[PDB]
Symmetry: C2
């Protein structure tokens, strides 16, 4: 029983964190096998970030312009190249702690664990969701660039995010491990701003199912609703439009609890219109949207209290 915003164990990722320095800038790098991945802006000086031409700035560097350190030990870079917004540094030795892994680009609404690091050392781990607007509401301080987001399936680590910057509102932006930004953001100092955001409807529904699985159903009702009728209401509350695909995804959860998806949508509709009246769901006073249906199934019992 119980329900927490839990992250994946971070050990497999901790063993891949290193420090990367160029000039006076230092940040984190991801060391897999004989390669180290890090934000390309590590090569930028103060004035460079205003309007940097990375191709021009990088061609002026050599392998020895980069100082990679695993702990206090230096790793000799024997090659370098740029891949979109990331730098790929080849080193003269392999990381024996490299776990089975793959590079994946996630979709907004999905969740992942983040191992916040500073100077190549782990600070903490937390779970979050990529907002529909591609930003993440993380906890990063200066020097956290290069920290990565990931998910773990069995013993295979799927890296999906590398931290690059913080926007005006205090939210964060980054890229996948191929160096491609999530969102319209760019790695330079400009008037960038997070776009409009919405609540991840699919996740809120998944969360309501988690509550039922855990024995609570005070928010249910005798009504049902049309997908369209639900969206007409939900969209008024800044909720992401729900599609048939989302409904289908909730199938397993629906089957385990005996509550039809549209019936749960009817419950959510009522919660949005009438509020929670001082009550709580899984200990929360607000509707949580950082748990995907997959997260709920993974954390909750396969058998509902009843």
């Amino acid at each position: 029983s119980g329900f927490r915003k839990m992250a994946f164990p971070s050990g497999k990722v901790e063993g891949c964190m290193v420090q990367v320095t160029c000039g006076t800038t230092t940040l984190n790098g991801l060391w897999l096998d004989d390669t180290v991945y890090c934000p390309r802006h590590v090569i930028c000086t103060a004035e460079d970030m205003l309007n940097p031409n990375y191709e021009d700035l990088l061609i002026r560097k050599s392998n020895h312009s980069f100082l990679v350190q695993a702990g206090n030990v230096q790793l000799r870079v024997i090659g370098h190249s740029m891949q979109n917004c990331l730098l790929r540094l080849k080193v003269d030795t392999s990381n024996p702690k490299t776990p089975k892994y793959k590079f994946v680009r996630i979709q907004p609404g999905q969740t992942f664990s983040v191992l916040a690091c500073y100077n190549g050392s782990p600070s903490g781990v937390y779970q979050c969701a990529m907002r529909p607007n591609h930003t993440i509401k993380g906890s990063f301080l200066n020097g956290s660039c290069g920290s990565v987001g990931f998910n773990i399936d069995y013993d295979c680590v799927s890296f999906c995010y590398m931290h690059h910057m913080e926007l005006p509102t205090g939210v964060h932006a980054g890229t996948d491990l191929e160096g491609k930004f999530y969102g319209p953001f760019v790695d330079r100092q400009t008037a960038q701003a997070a776009g409009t955001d919405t609540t991840i409807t699919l996740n809120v529904l998944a969360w309501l199912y988690a509550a039922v699985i855990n024995g609570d159903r005070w928010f249910l009702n005798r009504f049902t609703t049309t997908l369209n009728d639900f969206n007409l209401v939900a969209m008024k509350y800044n909720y992401e439009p729900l599609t048939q695909d989302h409904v289908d995804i909730l199938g397993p959860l629906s089957a385990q609890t005996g509550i039809a998806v549209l019936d749960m949508c009817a419950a959510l509709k009522e919660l949005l219109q009438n509020g929670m009246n001082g009550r709580t769901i899984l200990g929360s006073t607000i509707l949580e949207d950082e748990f995907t249906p997959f997260d709920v199934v993974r954390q909750c019992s396969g058998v509902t209290f009843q």
Copy 2:
């Protein structure tokens, strides 16, 4: 930059988790050097919990009765004993991944990270607090027994919790690493239940300081209050009584912000009596009580391990 309730990196602990099987009962064990620690009820069965005599039950067991598995390797048990509510199994191999560590008994209100494990395999990690009523609001499923709670100091891991059971309200109970339960709970079938719980005032105050440190300070005012007047109000909202010791524990934060603890109490009093008026503190609509004064400094400063 945001404020997230985060857990300690779990790598050092993951390397110590193993599976302990006894007959049809399987749970998790903590392998440090050549000893594996796990809940003693691993020598029980469904019926064995409703009235155990661990003393007698353990006698019918010998070294080969215990199967310890670390990864895909079998750890040969060469000795065994019981320490309070724990089983101590001596194995023929000292864990190559044993970190610097210590066993500590946490106090009510203090937090720690929990590494949920099943069949010796870590599945997730989350932060939680030892509630004033001696239970923890964790997330555990069958097979999680043996999972541990911990804190990290530089390079030293302080183990403070080992999971043993779930109470009727869905909350959890366990022991320190010496096998002594937190609270009055026992590893047996009884009518035991969690008592009433209160909000951890010390932590709520620590969190308000965190908010201030992060620039969220709209709730501060130019007044103060006596400790007694604060408690008269706080206790009406089911908050733990604030003690002079708590005030002193908040000293570093108070010094850092230049806001006296009692001045912060005045702020909190107003928040409890008038609410937030639709405002947010560190993006939250409620007062968080699972961040200790130590967690705040840790996260606001860039402490790494």
